[PDB]
Design a protein around this ligand. Structure first.
Ligand SMILES: Cc1cc(N(C)CCN(C)C)cc(C)c1OCC(=O)N[C@@H](Cc1ccccc1)[C@H](O)C(=O)N1CSC(C)(C)[C@H]1C(=O)N[C@H]1c2ccccc2C[C@H]1O
Ligand SMILES: C[C@H](CCC(=O)NCCC[N+](C)(C)CCCS(=O)(=O)[O-])[C@H]1CC[C@H]2[C@@H]3[C@H](O)C[C@@H]4C[C@H](O)CC[C@]4(C)[C@H]3C[C@H](O)[C@]12C
Length: 328
C-alpha cells in the first residue's frame, strides 16, 4: 500500500497538505513544492510578524529533537526565510522518519506572501543536489528504509468544489487518472524538467525546457513568446503587476499544446483562466506570467497539474503525465 496525504484547495489558486514534526506530533500546513529540496517550519523562536498566526515548532517539547544549529538562509524566487538546521521525527501521512529541516526564525523576507497565505512552511519534493545541507529527499529516504514500494510520488490535485486531492507516496494508483500514462525522461540531473515542443497556435518553440512544478500557481512562458501570444489578443495588463486581464469568453484565447514523440498535452483557456467577477463582470485574469530563463523554459505549474495527474519518479528519472479523473 501507499502513503496518501490529502490536499486541500486554497481559493482555487493553490493547495496545501499537512504533516507533523516532533514526537509529540506538532501539526503544520505545507506548500508541497516539487521545485525545492528543503523542509522548513516556523519556530517558537521566530521574531517576526508573519509567525504570529502560524503553527509554530517547539523543539523542547519533542524528545526526538536533535540539536544542529547551523545557520541557514533559504532563498526562493519569491522571497527569503532564515533560521537554523534542526533534526526531528517528521511524519507524512502514516509514515515517519528522522529528518533534517530548517527551523525558521525570520520570515520578513517572505512578505507579503507569508502573512496573507495560510501555510506554515514549505516541504520540498525535489532532488538532493538542490537542497541546502545535502539532505536526502523524503521519498528517497522512505524507499531506502523499505517503508514504501517505489521512490516515486504522485499529485492528484484538488478541484475547487468538485473534489479534494492527494499527494501519494510510493506508487501509482489507477483511481487518479484516465487514458494513458506517458513517461517523459528528465533532461536535467536535479530538476523535474522535461523536453517538449511548445505550440500556441502559429507560435512554436522546439524542444523547450518544461518544468513541472507544484509550488508555482501559474503557467510561465518566455517573455518573447508571450509577447507574440498577446499581440492583438484584446487582453490588458494590470498596472504594476505581471498579470493580464481579459473578457472570460474572449474567442481569441489560445490553447497551449506541448508535444513529445511519446505524448501530447494541451491547456485550454478554461484551465488557465481565473474569474475575477468582484473586479468586474465577465472579467478573467490569465494565470500566465512571462519569465526568461537562460534557456527558453516553461513552468507547468498548478494550472497544468489541475488537468494532468503527474508522477515524479526518482528511480526512473522521469515525469509521468496522464489526464486526471474528473472525480473520485
Ligand atoms: C530552492 C532553490 C535553490 C537553489 N540553490 C542555489 C541550491 C544550491 N545548493 C547546493 C545550496 C537554486 C534555485 C533556482 C532554487 O529554486 C528557487 C525557487 O524559488 N524555485 C521555485 C520555482 C521557480 C523557479 C524559477 C523561476 C520561478 C519559479 C519553487 O519551487 C516554488 O515553486 N516557489 C518559491 S516559494 C513558493 C511559494 C513555494 C513558490 C513560488 O514562488 N510561487 C509563486 C510564483 C512563481 C512563479 C510564477 C507565479 C507564482 C505565484 C506563486 O505561486
Ligand atoms: C520570479 C520572477 C522573476 C524575478 C527575477 O527577475 N529575479 C529573481 C531575483 C518574479 C517577477 C515578478 C514576480 C511576481 C510578482 O511580484 C507578483 C506576485 C507578488 C506576490 O508576492 C505573489 C508572487 C508574485 C506572483 C511574484 C512571484 C515571482 O517572484 C515573480 C514572478
Amino acid at each position: 500500500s501507499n502513503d496518501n496525504i490529502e490536499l486541500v484547495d486554497f481559493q482555487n489558486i493553490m493547495f496545501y497538505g499537512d504533516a507533523e514534526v516532533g514526537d509529540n506530533q506538532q501539526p503544520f500546513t505545507f506548500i508541497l513544492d516539487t521545485g525545492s529540496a528543503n523542509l522548513w517550519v516556523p519556530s517558537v523562536k521566530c521574531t517576526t510578524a508573519g509567525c504570529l498566526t502560524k503553527h509554530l515548532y517547539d523543539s523542547s517539547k519533542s524528545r526526538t529533537y536533535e540539536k544542529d544549529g547551523t545557520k541557514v538562509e533559504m532563498n526562493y524566487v519569491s522571497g527569503t526565510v532564515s533560521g537554523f538546521f534542526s533534526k526531528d521525527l517528521v511524519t507524512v501521512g502514516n509514515l515517519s522518519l528522522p529528518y533534517k529541516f530548517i527551523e525558521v526564525i525570520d520570515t520578513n523576507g517572505f512578505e507579503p506572501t507569508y502573512t496573507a497565505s495560510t501555510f506554515d512552511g514549505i516541504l520540498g519534493l525535489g532532488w538532493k543536489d538542490l537542497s541546502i545541507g545535502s539532505v536526502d529527499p523524503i521519498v528517497v529516504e522512505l524507499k531506502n528504509q523499505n517503508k514504501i514500494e517505489n521512490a516515486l510520488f504522485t499529485f492528484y490535485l484538488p478541484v475547487h468544489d468538485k473534489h479534494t486531492g492527494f499527494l501519494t507516496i510510493g506508487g501509482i494508483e489507477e483511481r487518479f487518472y484516465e487514458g494513458p500514462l506517458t513517461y517523459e525522461k528528465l533532461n536535467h540531473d536535479l530538476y523535474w524538467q522535461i523536453t517538449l515542443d511548445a505550440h500556441v497556435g502559429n507560435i512554436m518553440l522546439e524542444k523547450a525546457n518544461c518544468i513541472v512544478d507544484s509550488g508555482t500557481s501559474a503557467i510561465t512562458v518566455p517573455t518573447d513568446f508571450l509577447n507574440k501570444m498577446l499581440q492583438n489578443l484584446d487582453v490588458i495588463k494590470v498596472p504594476f503587476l505581471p498579470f493580464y486581464v481579459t473578457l472570460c469568453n474572449n474567442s481569441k484565447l489560445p490553447t497551449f499544446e506541448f508535444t513529445s514523440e511519446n505524448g501530447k498535452y494541451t491547456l485550454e483557456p478554461e484551465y488557465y483562466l481565473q474569474h475575477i467577477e468582484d473586479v468586474g463582470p465577465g472579467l478573467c485574469m490569465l494565470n500566465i506570467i512571462g519569465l526568461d530563463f537562460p534557456v527558453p523554459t516553461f513552468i507547468l505549474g498548478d494550472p497544468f497539474m489541475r488537468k494532468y495527474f503527474t508522477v515524479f519518479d526518482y528511480d526512473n528519472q522521469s515525469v509521468g503525465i496522464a489526464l486526471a479523473k474528473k472525480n473520485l
